[PDB]
C-alpha cells in the first residue's frame, strides 16, 4: 500500500524525459493493459511518432487517476489519449462499477483540460467471454454500456472519441474479430495496426486542424 497507483513504474522514465528537454506535440497514451501491450507489440509506432506510452497492465481507472499527475500532467504533453476501463471491467482488482469507472475517466479529462492538455477519449475494446464466467452477450453489453456514456460525454464536451470497438467487434455477439487477435482477449499486431490508423488520424486532427470559424 506504499505505492498503490504504481508511480514507481515510470518514475525513472519520466526523469529521463525531462533530461531530454522540451518536445513539441508530445502525445501521452494513458491506459491499462491495452496500452501497455500496444508498446510491447509495436514499439516503432510510438518511437517513430514521438508518442509516449504510459500503460500499466492490470491497473484500475481509480489508480490511473491517482498517477495522472505524474505520468501525464508533469510530462506537459500537447495531447493525452485516455484508454481506461478495460481492467475495471475485467475485475482483476475488485468488483466493476460503471458509475465509478466513468466518473474516473471524467476526472482524468478534467485534470487534463485544467492543465491545457487536449484529450482524446476511446472505446473499450471487445473481447471473448469465457462461458463459465459470462455469456458473450453479457460481456458485450457491459462494454457497450460504458462506451455509450463515454461517447455522450465526449459529444457534450466537444472531445474527440475514437471508436475502436465498432471496427473490431464482430457480429453477431460482439466477439473480438478473429483477424485482430491471437488469444481472443488482446489485440495481435494486425489489430493494433487497425487501432494505429484510427488513433493517428484523431491525433493529427487535434495537432493540425485549428481556428474553427464559427458562424
Amino acid at each position: 500500500k506504499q505505492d498503490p497507483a504504481n508511480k514507481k513504474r515510470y518514475a525513472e522514465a519520466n526523469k529521463e524525459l525531462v533530461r531530454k528537454g522540451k518536445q513539441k506535440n508530445r502525445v501521452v497514451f494513458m491506459g491499462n493493459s491495452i496500452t501497455e501491450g500496444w508498446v510491447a507489440n509495436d514499439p516503432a509506432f510510438f518511437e517513430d511518432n514521438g508518442y509516449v506510452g504510459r500503460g500499466i497492465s492490470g491497473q484500475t481507472s481509480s489508480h490511473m487517476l491517482e498517477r495522472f499527475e505524474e505520468d501525464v500532467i508533469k510530462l506537459k504533453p500537447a495531447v493525452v489519449v485516455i484508454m481506461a476501463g478495460t481492467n475495471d471491467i475485467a475485475e482483476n482488482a475488485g468488483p466493476y462499477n460503471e458509475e465509478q469507472t466513468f466518473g474516473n475517466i471524467v476526472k482524468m479529462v478534467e485534470l487534463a483540460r485544467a492543465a491545457k492538455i487536449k484529450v482524446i477519449l476511446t472505446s473499450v475494446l471487445p473481447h471473448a467471454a469465457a462461458p463459465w464466467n459470462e455469456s458473450q452477450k453479457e460481456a458485450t453489453q457491459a462494454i457497450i454500456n460504458l462506451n455509450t456514456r463515454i461517447i455522450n460525454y465526449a459529444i457534450e464536451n466537444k472531445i474527440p472519441f475514437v471508436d475502436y470497438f465498432v471496427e473490431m467487434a464482430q457480429s453477431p455477439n460482439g466477439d473480438l474479430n478473429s483477424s485482430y487477435t491471437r488469444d481472443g482477449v488482446h489485440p495481435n499486431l494486425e489489430g493494433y495496426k487497425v487501432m494505429e490508423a484510427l488513433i493517428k488520424k484523431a491525433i493529427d486532427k487535434v495537432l493540425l486542424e485549428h481556428h474553427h470559424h464559427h458562424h
Partner: antibody
Amino acid sequence: QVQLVESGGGVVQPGRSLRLSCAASGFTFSTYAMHWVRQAPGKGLEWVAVISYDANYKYYADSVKGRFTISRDNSKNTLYLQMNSLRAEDTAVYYCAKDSQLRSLLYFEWLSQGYFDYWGQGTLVTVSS
Amino acid sequence: DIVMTQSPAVSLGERATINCKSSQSVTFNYKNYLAWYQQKPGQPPKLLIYWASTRESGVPDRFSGSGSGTDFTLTISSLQAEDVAVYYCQQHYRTPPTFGQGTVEIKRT
C-alpha cells in the same frame, strides 16, 4: 410537450403495401432511437422495429423481417414504416414510440433498448380484400 | 425472445397489485430493465414506471413499482375508477422488447 403524430393508416389489399409516418416534436428527435409497435384488435403489444438515432442501424421483429423497412428523416423529425406484402395478420393499430436512451449504440440486433417514454396516437391498418 | 407473463379484483379505494414474471432475469449490473404502462380504450399506452421502480412524471403517486430479476409488481395504493385499464409490463433488456398484459378490475357485489 413531446408529441408523436401518426398518419397514413387505412385499408390495404393483401400483398400490397403502405407507408406510415410519425411526425415528432418537442424533443431532439435526431438524438434518439425510434420504434414501431403494433396491437392487433383485442390483443397485446408487439414490437415491430427500431432505427438508431443516426439511421445507421435498423432491426425488425421476426414476424416482419423481409417485408418491412423502417426509415427516418432527421431534417423533418419524422419516422416512417414502409410495409410491403401485407397480410391479414398485419391488421393492427400501429404506434410509433420514442426510446428513452440518449444516442444508443445499436451495433447488434439483440442489445438492450430503452423504455418507451412517449407514444404516438396510433393509426389503424386493415389488411383485407 | 424473453417472455413476459402476468400471473394473477379489488374494491374501490383498496390496494391493487399486478404481478409480472420474465422468463429470464432482466436485471443487469444493478438496473432492472422493466417498465409499466397503462392503456385506456382508444389511446396509446402511457408510461407509468421505469427502471422497475421510478414513477414517471405526472403519474399519480398511488402508482408504484417494485421487484427485481424475474419478479415485478405494480401497486396501486388506492384503486380508483379511472384506474380500470389494461396494464403492460415491458422488458427492454434484450431486443425484441416484449410486453406482458393483464387487467385491473373493480371488485363489487
